[PDB]
Amino acid sequence: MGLKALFFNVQGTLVDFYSTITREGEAFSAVRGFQADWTTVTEQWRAEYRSRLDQVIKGERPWTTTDRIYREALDGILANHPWGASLNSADRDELNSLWSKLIPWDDTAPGLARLRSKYITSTLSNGSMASVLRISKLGALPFDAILTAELVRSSKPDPKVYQLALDSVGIEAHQAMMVACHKYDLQAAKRLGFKVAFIARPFEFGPNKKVDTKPEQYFDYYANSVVELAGMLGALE
Amino acid sequence: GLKALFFNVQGTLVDFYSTITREGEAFSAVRGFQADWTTVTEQWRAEYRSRLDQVIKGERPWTTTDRIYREALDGILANHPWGASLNSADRDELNSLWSKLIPWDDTAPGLARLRSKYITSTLSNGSMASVLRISKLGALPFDAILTAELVRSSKPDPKVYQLALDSVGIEAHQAMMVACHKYDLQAAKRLGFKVAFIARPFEFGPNKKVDTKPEQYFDYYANSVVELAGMLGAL
Ligand SMILES: [Ca+2]
Incomplete structure (x- = not known):
């Protein structure tokens, strides 16, 4: 639980x-x-x-x-x-x-490997399965599953996409955590009972453009990297 | 190719x-x-x-x-x-x-070698939840986990094979179905896939005779995933 x-x-x-x-x-x-x-x-x-x-x-x-x-x-x-x-x-x-071919942030692969040692890990994004698969393969990003909203022909924040994640992994909402750098995504998953982790990505739109990275009250976790998220979840390997 | x-x-x-x-x-x-x-x-x-x-x-x-x-x-x-x-x-x-199904000894090494050369994915009839767990517990590497549950059906339904092509973004002739069951390879072949048969003489234990004979329509016939990796140049 x-x-x-x-x-x-x-x-x-x-x-x-x-x-x-x-x-x-x-x-x-x-x-x-x-x-x-x-x-x-x-x-x-x-x-x-x-x-x-x-x-x-x-x-x-x-x-x-x-x-x-x-x-x-x-x-x-x-x-x-x-x-x-x-x-x-x-x-x-x-x-x-x-x-x-989108390249990983320099924290992504080691943080994903650590989290996978402790949890089931999966993508859940809006892009095509084909592109997310190749992004993960080319970046050597480890996952237990590749899921995208394509599988239900929709897009987050559509509840169907979050339910797709729960049905595919066979868990309830309170046993799931949505991880994103986009607040609309976490807000939607939180309303459906997910835990949520926010990763601040201050360079998402380039080195010079200010992005909204401030914490919010409803975040279960606030991290500056996937590695840091692994540390706070106690995830090693 | x-x-x-x-x-x-x-x-x-x-x-x-x-x-x-x-x-x-x-x-x-x-x-x-x-x-x-x-x-x-x-x-x-x-x-x-x-x-x-x-x-x-x-x-x-x-x-x-x-x-x-x-x-x-x-x-x-x-x-x-x-x-x-x-x-x-x-x-x-x-x-x-x-x-929690236990991998054959050849499965993990063979899968790792094939993934260094090809995109690899499951495509089976079970639940997403179980196949994901089997592969995680067994340290089976894949680029994706797909099952027929994602179109609420089962092989040999053509929707299941089309799910594989749509998901990986390739054409049938660029794809290979790998199985120890002939009904599966037969259906994929008719839809333009390449097919590889892995003989599994102990699938039902050491006391039952199972059909492991080759067939003319098999693109590859192997006794292990490692052997299939050698045939595909994934040495
Ligand atoms: Ca994987």
């Missing part, structure tokens, strides 16, 4: 998407010999993705994998950039694959 | 016969009664398959495989006078062995 399973958000919470897109974007453009502002490109790509995602959620657009939403959002924002028209379909697939 | 391998679990990777017999023998010892546990595996699977088909044929609303295994245990225990000396709590605990 204690804590039995931890479920992890992925983007930002475990992986530094900002550094992935910007650093690999810059290499991509530098070799082709054109100037590009990958900070702006990254922010626009995310905004267009989330706008189209919101249209999928509302039913305005037909359901599709997040991989395709990113790929189509990429076509949209590239029209804002004169060099974008020079990028062929294979060039755009290459850029889009970066979202399946 | 090949991108991902999907593994059946019971029999293919883990020895449920020995798990049943040795945990059963432990249960009978503490409670102070004797029982021929060598035949219980056969009985339990039979009762289970019958009750499962009640879910499959729609005679019963969908329920977890672990629940069905728990009810099948009531079924077989009513056939033995010693069954009554296991109360509901004992049967609950006994039924939990299906989340």
Whole structure:
């Protein structure tokens, strides 16, 4: 009846998407010999993705994998950039694959290994199963299971996604903990009876952008890294 | 070329016969009664398959495989006078062995070698909760855990194989079904998967003859996961 399973958000919470897109974007453009502002490109790509995602959620657009939403959002924002028209379909697939390569924060893999020695661990994020699987494999991020909202064709904070986690691992809400750096996610899981752990990610949107990392009253745990979370949960190995 | 391998679990990777017999023998010892546990595996699977088909044929609303295994245990225990000396709590605990199945000796090394070259995942009929526990307890590494529970069905339903392709994001010809059961490889093959058969001559113990013969439609035929790893260049 204690804590039995931890479920992890992925983007930002475990992986530094900002550094992935910007650093690999810059290499991509530098070799082709054109100037590009990958900070702006990254922010626009995310905004267009989330706008189209919101249209999928509302039913305005037909359901599709997040991989395709990113790929189509990429076509949209590239029209804002004169060099974008020079990028062929294979060039755009290459850029889009970066979202399946998001690199871990330097604390993520060792903290995940420690937590897995004491708990059942699983992802629980909104991205496609295919991309979360590859992110975990490429980052050598250990998990007992890979779950995403794709499996119920939805998105957090939809209660179905949290219930998916409880049904798949076979535990009750009070035996589960949602781990994220996004407060909407923890608020929703807390209302459904989960324990919640907040991981402060002050560089989620790059080294220079202020992010909301302040503690909240309803957090069971407040940590600055997955390693620190493991320490406070007494998780070794 | 090949991108991902999907593994059946019971029999293919883990020895449920020995798990049943040795945990059963432990249960009978503490409670102070004797029982021929060598035949219980056969009985339990039979009762289970019958009750499962009640879910499959729609005679019963969908329920977890672990629940069905728990009810099948009531079924077989009513056939033995010693069954009554296991109360509901004992049967609950006994039924939990299906989340604790012991790997064959070749399973973990073979799985680790294959994962260094390919994406790897379970794809079996049991509950997500049990397969996850089996793999965790047995230190079986995978990139993902999938079971037919995620589409509330069972192999050979094409939805289960499509779940595997949709989840890993690949095409059928880039995927390989790995199993010691021919109905499973037959269905996956017809859907364009590659297939690999692992012969498991002791799946039902040392005293029963099981079908381990090769078939022409098998892309690979092996006697262990380690042997399959060698065939796939995952040395
Ligand atoms: Ca895993």
